[PDB]
Amino acid sequence: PTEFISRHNIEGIFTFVDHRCVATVGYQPQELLGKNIVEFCHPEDQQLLRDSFQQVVKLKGQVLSVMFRFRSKNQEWLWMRTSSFTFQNPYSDEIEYIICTNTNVK
Amino acid sequence: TEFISRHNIEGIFTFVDHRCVATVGYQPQELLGKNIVEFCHPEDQQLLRDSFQQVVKLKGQVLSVMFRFRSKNQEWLWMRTSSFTFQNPYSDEIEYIICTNTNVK
Ligand SMILES: FC(F)(F)c1cc(-c2nn[nH]n2)cc(C(F)(F)F)c1
Incomplete structure (x- = not known):
């Protein structure tokens, strides 16, 4: 596992x-959810x-x-590459979410 | 390169995302609703x-x-897809399958 996908509100929360965050950055999902x-x-x-x-x-x-x-x-700085795009639906004017793919560089 | 797709349980x-154009040659509109x-x-x-x-x-x-x-353009492309089920935080019901799709080459 090299990456995990995250969904964010417009402010970054x-x-x-996805559960690959464990292997990527060391956190369980519940240690990230609700935080920016x-x-x-x-x-x-x-x-x-x-x-x-x-x-x-x-x-x-x-x-x-x-x-x-x-x-x-474990409190080390990891170089991360994030690729982001907005998600919307056509019965809505609102951009609802940002989808991020978060990849460990090395 | 790669693109993300969201599927129902059956594969529809x-x-x-728009990177599908460069990866598989289709506009999103040419894939949506199909399995x-x-x-x-x-x-x-x-x-x-x-x-x-x-x-x-x-x-x-x-x-x-x-x-x-x-x-x-009607050629076979080797794809690697990584898939997982999505549900809202601290919620049990499986809503979608999320796929990350890479053309391997
Ligand atoms: F972050 C993910 F969980 F992977 C995700 C969630 C949703 C979604 N959230 N609510 N409805 N769909 C949509 C997408 C996609 F951009 F791929 F379509 C991805």
């Missing part, structure tokens, strides 16, 4: 994480990650990738 | 069917399968 992904991001990378979330909602379903350091469970 | 495309098994080489079709039956039993754990996908 984890609302679903930005809370696991190295301070120096935090604005970069915030901008990505603002930009991905403008791209309207097109994918945006970003790299940043993620705080693993 | 209910969402596909992924309809794009699968006959020889791989039972293997892909079993995967959908098995992934629902694995309850959130990932299952990978490889199969040949009929691209838009």
Whole structure:
């Protein structure tokens, strides 16, 4: 396992994480759910990650990738590549979620 | 490259991200409402069917399968799909299967 998929609200809160997060970043799903992904991001990378979330909602379903350091469970910084896109449905004007694929770089 | 698709329990495309164009040659609109098994080489079709039956039993754990996908220009592309069932946090009901689809080459 190299990656896991997460669903976020527009502000960055984890609302679903697949069980591969254990092998990838060391956390059980319940240790991520309800928290903001930005809370696991190295301070120096935090604005970069915030901008990505603002930009991905403008791209309207097109994918945006970003790299940043993620705080693993054993308190080491892991280089992470996240590819993000918005999810919507056509009986709605609202962008409902952001879908992220979170891949451990090395 | 790769794209994410959302499926019902039987394999019907209910969402596909736009990277499907570069990966398999179809617009999302050309896949939606169809079963992924309809794009699968006959020889791989039972293997892909079993995967959908098995992934629902694995309850959130990932299952990978490889199969040949009929691209838009009518060539067989080897695909690696990693699948897991999705349910809302702390909620029991399986709503969808999520697939990450890579053309292996
Ligand atoms: F993050 C995931 F769990 F993997 C996910 C959830 C949903 C969904 N959430 N509520 N309804 N669908 C939709 C997608 C997709 F973008 F692939 F379609 C992915």
